[PDB]
């Protein structure tokens, strides 16, 4: 019938779903099914960003190019379609000779029934591929043509990849088919790349997932200046589970730290000081880590204590130590709350820690370089750390530092992080952790 009915129908009897996980996904698959935009979808891991092209390849009369970066994960996108008893096929480096020799043959087959091919970006830019992929070109086939992971065209959203430089020009010889870029890495250094290096056209259909979740309460505290460390955690745990209350204790919580042996020391100072916690590592059997993960499922154990890692009612968060970026500890910190009922971000910061995390990172940047030289992409680890860092020690918003790394808009915070509750505070806070270096 009308678009919507045609999406409606495919979604659920092709996917089975009643209905999209968001609003944003389903404008975002509305317009990239209209087909007169360039579209760019950025959503987290997981929201499901790949129904945005999925679906409307099945409603669209050719064949849709999905470029993907590892054949790991696209054989599970495929193996999923297959489940799906969709239509797929992946040409890739793990095909035999001969079994490109088929492939091949449907594509340049009249009226090919290959509907989505998902293809490294590699084999869309080898001089191998150019007579296949010219032949879809001049005989009109192409529906879309689809960049996955589209972060790696940037020197700064972590995996950088070289071919990835060549789908602009790739785009451009189809004018006629919409160009869709699909990531979950959201800064505004790596939107203008994506644009630049697909050769997008312009205006472009943005389809973002805002960052601001008003229920979740930011702030920082500074080790330096608590007396009691073990203590201070003991209590924000106990507050947020609902100590005041006096029901019972609510929800569940995590507390990341970054070794095993801080683990340990802190899953046992806060059970011996009044809550109920359990070590997480990968230093830990499988058989205890499984069972430590259920009896939290289970609300068993109100509060993990984790090194590595989706439960609704996680009521706080707490980082003992720095995050290593910024895109990590939001994250992390993003966790809580999901249930949408208030809950409590807090990250303990010391400039120790910051240090010490400072020295690792730049350790690890150093093995890569003895690895495989100098890359332009180095500084993007520094810089991810860094904005954290700032997070950490510069007054205003938590959520507003948060907004800007993303570049989204000023968020409405109505007392909901530290600063915005009391900024003097805050400050008075910050003037002590530079009187704890004085002279
Ligand atoms: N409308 C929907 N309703 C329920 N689940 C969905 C919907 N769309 C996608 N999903 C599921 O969400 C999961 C995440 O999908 P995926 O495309 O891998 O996310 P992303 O690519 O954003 O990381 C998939 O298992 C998918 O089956
Ligand atoms: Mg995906
Ligand atoms: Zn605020």
């Given at each position: 019938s009308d678009p919507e009915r045609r999406v409606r129908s495919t979604l659920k009897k092709?996917?089975?779903?009643?209905?999209?996980?968001?609003p944003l996904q389903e404008s975002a698959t509305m317009a990239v099914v209209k087909g007169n935009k360039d579209v760019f979808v950025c959503m987290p891991?997981?929201?499901?960003?790949?129904l945005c092209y999925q679906l409307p390849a099945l409603l669209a009369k050719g064949i849709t190019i999905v470029v993907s970066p590892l054949i790991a994960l696209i054989q599970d996108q495929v193996d999923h379609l297959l489940t799906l008893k969709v239509r797929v096929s992946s040409l890739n480096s793990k095909l035999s000779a001969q079994e490109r020799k088929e492939l091949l043959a449907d594509l340049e087959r009249?009226?090919?029934?290959?509907k989505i091919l998902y293809i490294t970006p590699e084999m869309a830019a080898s001089s191998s591929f150019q007579p296949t992929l010219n032949s879809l070109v001049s005989r009109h086939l192409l529906s879309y043509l689809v960049v996955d992971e589209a972060h790696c065209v940037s020197q700064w959203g972590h995996d950088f990849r070289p071919d990835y430089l060549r789908l602009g020009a790739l785009r451009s010889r189809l004018g006629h088919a919409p160009c869709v870029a699909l990531t979950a890495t959201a800064t505004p250094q790596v939107q203008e790349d994506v644009f630049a290096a697909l050769h997008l056209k312009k205006p472009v259909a943005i389809f973002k997932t805002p960052c601001?979740?008003?229920n979740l309460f930011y702030d920082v505290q500074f080790k330096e200046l608590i007396s009691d460390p073990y203590g201070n955690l003991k209590d924000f745990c106990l507050k947020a589970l609902?100590?005041?209350?006096?029901?019972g204790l609510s929800g569940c919580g995590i507390v990341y730290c970054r070794t095993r042996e801080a683990c340990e020391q802190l899953a046992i100072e806060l059970s011996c000081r009044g809550v109920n916690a359990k070590a997480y590592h990968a230093g830990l059997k499988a058989s205890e880590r499984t069972l430590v993960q259920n009896d939290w499922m289970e609300e068993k154990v109100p509060v993990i204590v984790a090194t590595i890692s989706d439960k609704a009612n996680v009521r706080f968060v707490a980082h003992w130590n720095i995050a290593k970026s910024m895109a990590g500890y939001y994250q992390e910190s993003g966790r809580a709350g999901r249930d949408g009922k208030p809950s409590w971000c807090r990250l303990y910061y010391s400039r120790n820690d910051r240090d010490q995390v400072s020295f690792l990172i730049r350790k690890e940047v150093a093995k890569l370089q003895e690895k495989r030289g100098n890359k332009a992409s180095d500084k993007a680890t520094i810089m991810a750390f860094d904005a954290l860092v700032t997070f950490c020690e510069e007054l205003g918003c938590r959520h507003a530092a948060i907004a800007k790394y993303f570049g989204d808009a000023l968020p409405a915070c109505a007392k909901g992080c530290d600063h915005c509750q009391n900024p003097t505070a805050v400050r008075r806070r910050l003037e002590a952790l530079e009187r704890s270096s004085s002279w």
């Amino acid at each position: 019938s009308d678009p919507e009915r045609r999406v409606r129908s495919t979604l659920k009897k092709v996917f089975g779903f009643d209905s999209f996980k968001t609003p944003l996904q389903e404008s975002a698959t509305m317009a990239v099914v209209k087909g007169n935009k360039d579209v760019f979808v950025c959503m987290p891991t997981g929201a499901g960003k790949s129904l945005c092209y999925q679906l409307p390849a099945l409603l669209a009369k050719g064949i849709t190019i999905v470029v993907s970066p590892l054949i790991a994960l696209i054989q599970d996108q495929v193996d999923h379609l297959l489940t799906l008893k969709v239509r797929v096929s992946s040409l890739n480096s793990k095909l035999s000779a001969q079994e490109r020799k088929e492939l091949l043959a449907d594509l340049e087959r009249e009226k090919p029934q290959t509907k989505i091919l998902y293809i490294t970006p590699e084999m869309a830019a080898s001089s191998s591929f150019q007579p296949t992929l010219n032949s879809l070109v001049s005989r009109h086939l192409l529906s879309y043509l689809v960049v996955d992971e589209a972060h790696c065209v940037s020197q700064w959203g972590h995996d950088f990849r070289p071919d990835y430089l060549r789908l602009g020009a790739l785009r451009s010889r189809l004018g006629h088919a919409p160009c869709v870029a699909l990531t979950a890495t959201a800064t505004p250094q790596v939107q203008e790349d994506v644009f630049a290096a697909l050769h997008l056209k312009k205006p472009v259909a943005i389809f973002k997932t805002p960052c601001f979740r008003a229920n979740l309460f930011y702030d920082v505290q500074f080790k330096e200046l608590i007396s009691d460390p073990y203590g201070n955690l003991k209590d924000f745990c106990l507050k947020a589970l609902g100590q005041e209350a006096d029901k019972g204790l609510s929800g569940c919580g995590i507390v990341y730290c970054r070794t095993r042996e801080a683990c340990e020391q802190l899953a046992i100072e806060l059970s011996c000081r009044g809550v109920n916690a359990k070590a997480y590592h990968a230093g830990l059997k499988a058989s205890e880590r499984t069972l430590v993960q259920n009896d939290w499922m289970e609300e068993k154990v109100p509060v993990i204590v984790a090194t590595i890692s989706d439960k609704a009612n996680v009521r706080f968060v707490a980082h003992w130590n720095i995050a290593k970026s910024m895109a990590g500890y939001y994250q992390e910190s993003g966790r809580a709350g999901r249930d949408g009922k208030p809950s409590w971000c807090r990250l303990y910061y010391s400039r120790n820690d910051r240090d010490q995390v400072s020295f690792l990172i730049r350790k690890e940047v150093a093995k890569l370089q003895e690895k495989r030289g100098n890359k332009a992409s180095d500084k993007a680890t520094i810089m991810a750390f860094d904005a954290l860092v700032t997070f950490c020690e510069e007054l205003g918003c938590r959520h507003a530092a948060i907004a800007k790394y993303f570049g989204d808009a000023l968020p409405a915070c109505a007392k909901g992080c530290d600063h915005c509750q009391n900024p003097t505070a805050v400050r008075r806070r910050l003037e002590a952790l530079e009187r704890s270096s004085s002279w």
